[PDB]
């Protein structure tokens, strides 16, 4: 092939072996597949009903899964859906003071980003950068109807 430096052997052809490539890059120009971490918590991230037959990023579905593509669409990176496996989000220890959960995998260089229902708190803002709130919420009440009649 003809590259910038000039002619560059890529492979050799033979009648017995056909084309045998002997590559030059490996690479090359990989950049990186952005590692994304999240928690298996409904409805944000749920394993699909046929998660075994499927594989890759489609094995999960939920709100954050749809949010994963919409974020990568306006940015242009390739995400790799990974589960923290802990699986709750940190929250650090008292005397150990080691970050755990999704926030920990960001500081310690394991993951590159984390998208999930992560509560924006002050203790988390000091170690990582938080985006603007994509979903406002708060403490609320939950009861039955009931009635039954009554």
């Amino acid at each position: 092939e003809l590259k910038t430096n000039g002619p560059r052997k890529i492979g050799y052809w033979s009648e017995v072996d056909k084309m045998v490539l002997t590559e030059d890059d490996t690479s090359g120009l990989e950049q990186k597949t952005v590692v994304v971490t999240t928690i298996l918590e409904s409805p944000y991230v749920m394993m699909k009903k046929n998660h075994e037959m499927l594989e890759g990023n489609e094995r999960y579905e939920g709100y954050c899964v749809d949010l994963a593509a919409e974020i990568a669409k306006h940015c242009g990176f390739k995400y790799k859906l990974t589960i923290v496996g802990d699986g709750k989000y940190g929250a650090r220890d008292a005397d150990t003071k080691i970050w755990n959960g999704m926030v920990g995998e960001l500081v310690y260089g394991k993951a590159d980003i984390a998208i999930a229902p992560l509560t924006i708190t002050l203790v988390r803002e000091e170690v990582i950068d938080f985006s603007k709130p994509f979903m406002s919420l708060g403490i609320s009440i939950m009861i039955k109807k009931p009635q039954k009649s009554k």
Binding site: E1, L2, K3, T4, G6, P7, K9, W13, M19, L21
Partner: protein, 150 residues
């Protein structure tokens, strides 16, 4: 005793590696068409839309008028993949007019279908951006040829 190895077997393999479906095949009837018959016989077996053009019988006082009119017909289907099955001297003639009209930027991809890829001048399209492939039988990397070139 034919010293020239069979190139048609090697060209059919290179078209498979690049996964080409429709491409332009320029040929000259003077050198022949044994390789043209090979890509046409396999055009049905492997589903190829070959746009074969005979560039052989052309006058030398109409080179600028016929070559520029040639790539006008290669624009009806938006041809971006071209195989040059010509002599070394005729490739440089095609190469020069490709640069004049500007069909060598990022997008096009040419294949010089001869055993002399490094024989002709090709630094001309080295920085255009279009990928250029070819074949070499005189491997200047071998030590035996290096003692010969010196």
């Amino acid at each position: 005793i034919q010293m020239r190895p069979d190139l048609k077997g090697a060209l059919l393999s290179l078209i498979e590696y690049y996964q080409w479906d429709k491409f332009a095949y320029l040929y000259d009837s003077d050198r022949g068409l044994s390789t043209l018959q090979a890509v046409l016989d396999s055009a049905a077996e492997k589903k190829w839309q070959v746009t074969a053009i005979n560039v052989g019988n052309i006058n030398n006082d109409k080179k600028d008028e016929t070559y520029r009119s040639l790539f006008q017909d290669l624009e009806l289907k938006k041809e971006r993949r071209v195989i040059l099955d010509c002599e070394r001297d005729k490739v440089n003639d095609i190469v020069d007019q490709v640069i004049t009209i500007g069909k060598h930027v990022k997008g096009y991809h040419y294949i010089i279908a001869n055993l002399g890829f490094t024989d002709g001048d090709l630094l001309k399209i080295q920085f255009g951006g279009a990928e250029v492939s070819g074949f070499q039988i005189v491997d200047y990397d071998d030590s035996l040829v290096s003692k010969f070139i010196e």
